[PDB]
Design an enzyme around this catalytic site. Structure first.
Site, PDB file in Angstrom:
ATOM      1  CG  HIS A  99      -5.395  -3.363   0.386  1.00  0.00           C
ATOM      2  ND1 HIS A  99      -5.219  -2.670  -0.880  1.00  0.00           N
ATOM      3  CD2 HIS A  99      -4.889  -2.862   0.969  1.00  0.00           C
ATOM      4  CE1 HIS A  99      -3.717  -1.700  -0.671  1.00  0.00           C
ATOM      5  NE2 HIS A  99      -4.191  -1.854   0.531  1.00  0.00           N
TER       6      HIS A  99
ATOM      7  CG  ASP B 187      -6.804  -3.621  -3.690  1.00  0.00           C
ATOM      8  OD1 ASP B 187      -8.628  -2.232  -3.170  1.00  0.00           O
ATOM      9  OD2 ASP B 187      -5.974  -3.452  -3.870  1.00  0.00           O
TER      10      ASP B 187
ATOM     11  CB  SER C 182      -1.204  -0.099   0.887  1.00  0.00           C
ATOM     12  OG  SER C 182      -2.171   0.805   0.358  1.00  0.00           O
TER      13      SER C 182
END
Length: 302
Positions: A279, A247, A160
């Site tokens: 995710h 996602d 991320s």
């Protein structure tokens, strides 16, 4: 008309929060809250188990002031010149810490890696530009550590916001010399975000502009938009850009687009969409040696 990475987007704020896109926790009234509650609980448990159950050693190190900490994990089987896997956690530059970031350690250590799980100062205490500068410091420090300890090779993974941070390793040649580049076996970009222009104007993601963004620095903080140079120093390094199937379309597309920018520039980069993962469990399952994600990481080592 939708948005920059999703031409059918119905809710831009929702497209920037991966928690709303899981297929898990559908028995709950708000699956987005349940996925995050589970993620924090289970990653914290993974971190405790490394030393409570799995016989793994940790050195607790400090590389700077504040939250500039790094835990280095190994066992009694680790060799003096064992390679170093460096994991850079997510949290939108505003949350998460080392305690939630150690799922990935156990299987790597069992395979003979040393693993560095790093932390960093968060926005708004630092601007995003200051965090990026501190991260250049971290990269210099970790390469000094691996030079001192004669490590055979380095692999970096970011998840991320951590994948965003990691991207600067390709464009800091005053710190990352060609010899340092040559030490990098692989770069792994898990579910990153690389073009910050939309989110910079979202109060959900960037409340009150805590990230400190403006039209003067928005390109500098967006790896999607950089003019990559000196690409051949990286030509031995394998680059894996990974998105999760479950996602948001904006996240998946940001990864497809970034893999395409790196491939066009000439990097040894691939795109992978990981089937059936969201995710969050793309990190949670890195604590399980035989999971699909754990095996993908093992296969990079071959």
């Amino acid at each position: 008309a939708g948005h920059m990475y999703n031409p059918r987007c119905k809710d831009l704020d929702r497209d920037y929060f991966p928690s709303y896109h899981t297929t898990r926790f559908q028995d709950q009234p708000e699956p987005n809250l349940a996925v995050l509650e589970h993620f924090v609980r289970v990653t914290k448990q993974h971190g405790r188990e490394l030393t409570e159950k799995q016989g793994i050693t940790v050195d607790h190190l400090r590389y700077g002031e504040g939250r500039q900490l790094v835990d280095v994990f190994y066992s009694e089987k680790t060799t003096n010149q064992a390679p170093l896997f460096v994991f850079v956690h997510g949290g939108y530059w505003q949350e998460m810490d080392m305690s939630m970031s150690c799922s990935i350690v156990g299987p790597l250590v069992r395979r003979g890696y040393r693993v560095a799980v790093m932390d960093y100062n968060l926005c708004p205490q630092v601007t995003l530009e200051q965090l990026m500068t501190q991260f250049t410091h971290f990269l210099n420090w970790i390469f000094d550590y691996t030079e001192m300890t004669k490590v055979s090779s380095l692999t970096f993974a970011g998840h991320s916001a951590g994948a965003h941070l990691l991207a600067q390793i390709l464009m800091r040649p005053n710190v990352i010399t060609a010899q340092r580049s040559k030490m990098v076996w692989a770069l792994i970009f898990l579910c990153g975000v690389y073009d910050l222009r939309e989110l910079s104007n979202l109060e959900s993601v960037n409340p009150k502009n805590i990230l400190g963004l403006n039209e003067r620095n928005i390109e500098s903080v967006s790896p999607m938009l950089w003019e990559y140079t000196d690409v051949t120093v990286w030509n031995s390094t394998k680059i894996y850009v990974v998105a999760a199937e479950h996602d948001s379309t904006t996240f998946i597309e940001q990864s497809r687009h970034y893999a395409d920018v790196l491939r066009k520039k000439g990097y040894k980069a691939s795109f992978t969409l990981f089937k059936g993962y969201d995710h969050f469990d793309i990190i949670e399952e890195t604590a399980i040696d035989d999971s699909d994600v754990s095996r993908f990481l093992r296969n990079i080592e071959i």
